[PDB]
Amino acid sequence: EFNILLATDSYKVTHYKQYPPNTSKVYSYFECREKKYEETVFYGLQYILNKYLKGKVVTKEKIQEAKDVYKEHFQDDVFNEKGWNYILEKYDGHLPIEIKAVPEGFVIPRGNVLFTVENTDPECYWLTNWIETILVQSWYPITVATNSREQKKILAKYLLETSGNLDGLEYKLHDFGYRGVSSQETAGIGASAHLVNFKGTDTVAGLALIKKYYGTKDPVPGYSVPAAEHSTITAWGKDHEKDAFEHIVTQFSSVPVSVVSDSYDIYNACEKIWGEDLRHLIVSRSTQAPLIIRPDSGNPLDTVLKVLEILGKKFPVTENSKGYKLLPPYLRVIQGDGVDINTLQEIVEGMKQKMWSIENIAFGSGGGLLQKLTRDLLNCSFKCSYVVTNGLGINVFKDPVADPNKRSKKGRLSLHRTPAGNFVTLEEGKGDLEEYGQDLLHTVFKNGKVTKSYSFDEIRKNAQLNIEL
Amino acid sequence: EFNILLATDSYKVTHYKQYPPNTSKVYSYFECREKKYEETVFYGLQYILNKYLKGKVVTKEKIQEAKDVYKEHFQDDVFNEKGWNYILEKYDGHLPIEIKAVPEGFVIPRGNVLFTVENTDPECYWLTNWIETILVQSWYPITVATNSREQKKILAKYLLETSGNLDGLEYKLHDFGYRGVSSQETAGIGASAHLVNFKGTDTVAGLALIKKYYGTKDPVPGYSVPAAEHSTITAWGKDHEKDAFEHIVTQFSSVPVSVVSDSYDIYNACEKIWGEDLRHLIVSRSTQAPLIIRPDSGNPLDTVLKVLEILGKKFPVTENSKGYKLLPPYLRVIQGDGVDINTLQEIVEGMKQKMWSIENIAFGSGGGLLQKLTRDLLNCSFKCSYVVTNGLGINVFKDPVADPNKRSKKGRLSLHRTPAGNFVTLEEGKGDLEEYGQDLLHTVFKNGKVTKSYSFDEIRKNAQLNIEL
């Protein structure tokens, strides 16, 4: 079982002896600091509140196990067994903490308060920063959702430019990162953060997380189609690649099917196997069940252009109303090797320069989508900004001399609409003056209970693009 | 509960229909492909075998749950219920799989088979690659352990050059990465891959993972010391940084204590507060309990050098037998910001040029140690190499025209010691010829049971550096 007593950085165990004497309150906030990723999607906190923070999280056994571990870990007795016993006996193991947060799915510019944490009992002044480590891991669902939405921005721009509309935009970036992430739990969290912006996923674990912690009107959060891998092609033997292709397309004749075609020679497969030997099987296919040719190797842009050029000469190409070339509706393409936000931009721009519509293509991303991201990318940070000591509050901050980018905000914080409809974070309790209207943070957690929640449908609506609205 | 049926890439649900008819065996292997990271530490598979693969992993309830999710996910009934029901009835939900692997902790050059997977029942030919996604996630503990051990090599070289020995080498790279990773489960896995090489960690989760899945003779795998964060300093007030310092070194007067000193001005704090105002508190400290000044900002190399020059002029420096300057034993330094393998190399090289011993310093790394890594880095791959169809085995592989690096191995594989003491992977069953001694691959899993396991103590032994030997 999970033990929140053992779910923190080791040094935090010793933090209670470091605060000034008579500290009654510790108040802290989370932000994506300014340093392009100018705006972030807030998503993932609700998962953490339910899975790890709500309910009876303290028991006598959990106190005892933390005791025994920390005695040997530090080779000394520094564990605050008294304060954890106080929480057990006084609150039946419920955390005396208040967390206020911007609604999930909201798109907020960099450098604004996203959530705040404070203790609701003077005796638990140390508890605020104890749970810093758990809460800061929200950087990851925030960064996946933000990085995924930025790629959707690129995709929407070139789809609209080459086709005249945004049809099928939500299926243009498909999650292929299950194997490429660091764990099963990461796969679920990251796939759900992708599904805030798109509908296509192969990481099954995201669907379960969404249903369990957020919910949707529809039965399934994400969708997928039948597809081949190298083992199901190569197992037929090198000389029988055509037999594998024919068997697979026939097996899924009425639904869309993706067939990786680069096992030996991608160019030969598109020109000779799909384009000649098996062309009859492809042309008969329905509009709703196209053959999706997937290259998996080589330079991502060079491969897509040569693949499209080959198919354009074996298959009937039309020109759409914007003047961009279109494969017949039974034939499409997916590029799922080496796709990240940077190469995605290079591919669609190169496709447009060669007059190919983005309608022809979808993208799969693995490591780029879920694994190649860090807390440093959006500068996610958690800092103390206000404490009460001897009954007097003081506005608290850091201001390192060698880096003004690491300066932290001062005092009690609030998030507001500006008169022009933008966002601003008010410092030093100044939101109490009511010059900017109402604080947009809501209490989402108080004294062990989740007090406000959002369905995954609300989050998706919140996270939409302007071009979509 | 965890459902193995919902723990794979979506398209693998459809793969049982794509293999050639009359296929009785699918045999697949894992390698860190060649393309410096010339050798990898094999670590982490035993965690996955116990947590996810062993025992009764299939139930009627699980099969039903999977059936309903996949019907909506694909908008088609494609799930192989008969195959999963066959496993329930014939083997009480135990997976008919055999996994052979190199012992954990072994240091193997790139491009060598590390483990193989095959089905043991002809009806379950599809199951070998169903569990590809689960197994491939071993890239992460392998990559953390490899990257951490390479940094230990760098540290070992420069400590030895500057001090004449390796005393304290195992404590020179400290895991700060708990908050910087993507999830709780990732934190446990990655911190345990670090403890294969070092003893210092602030990520408590990794300790429980080791004790539960690997084990140690010692009470705990990793250790830590009391340490301050910015909140415990800044909470005292901007004009009271000196009061916070003095309160903390007195609260932890008999154990080693790390104090972040860059809240406002790292160089003022070293020169004036530690250097003059609190110097008396410092000089009296024991060798066993030094003050560890920690800079958390600026250029990592420039800050460490300036910090050491400042301290060298306020405290009595000695010159060791190699001619390198040594702080007094009650005073040490830790750089725990912006540290990865590249900058770690720049720091110790810069310290050597300025004639500072590596004895003076340790390093703390967070994102670099546990989160800034991908499967691309060691090119961890899982590919099918052998199948039996119609009673005949055939050697299977991919060989994309665009990339020579993506070529896979052929046939049944074995791992051997060469005459010169190196390693070789024999293809096409040629290990049967017995010209190369015993296969170093061992059956670690068969038909639902873990058949050989290793203690964390033997893993640390296997992963030792040559310089340590």
Ligand SMILES: Cc1ccc(-n2cc3c(N4CCC[C@H](C(=O)NCc5ccc6sccc6c5)C4)ncnc3n2)cc1F
């Ligand atoms: C693994 C994977 C599978 C499919 C898609 N995908 C669906 C698209 C879509 N839809 C959704 C289905 C009904 C309807 C539809 O016409 N389908 C067929 C279709 C159309 C275009 C493309 S391009 C690559 C595949 C494909 C398939 C509306 N519209 C636009 N682009 C879409 N891409 C992307 C993937 F990464």
Ligand SMILES: Cc1ccc(-n2cc3c(N4CCC[C@H](C(=O)NCc5ccc6sccc6c5)C4)ncnc3n2)cc1F
């Ligand atoms: C968070 C943290 C804590 C300690 C270390 N750490 C211990 C070292 C060691 N030891 C081990 C303990 C007993 C004994 C010892 O002298 N201790 C105190 C000590 C000595 C050197 C240094 S340098 C930075 C900190 C520090 C502390 C022998 N020998 C060499 N270098 C060592 N670094 C590194 C960290 F990142």
Ligand SMILES: NC(=O)c1cccnc1
């Ligand atoms: N459906 C796919 O093509 C896929 C899924 C997961 C990983 N790689 C590719």
Ligand SMILES: NC(=O)c1cccnc1
């Ligand atoms: N002990 C430390 O100094 C520490 C731990 C975790 C994160 N940052 C710093």
Ligand SMILES: [Cl-]
């Ligand atoms: Cl209890």
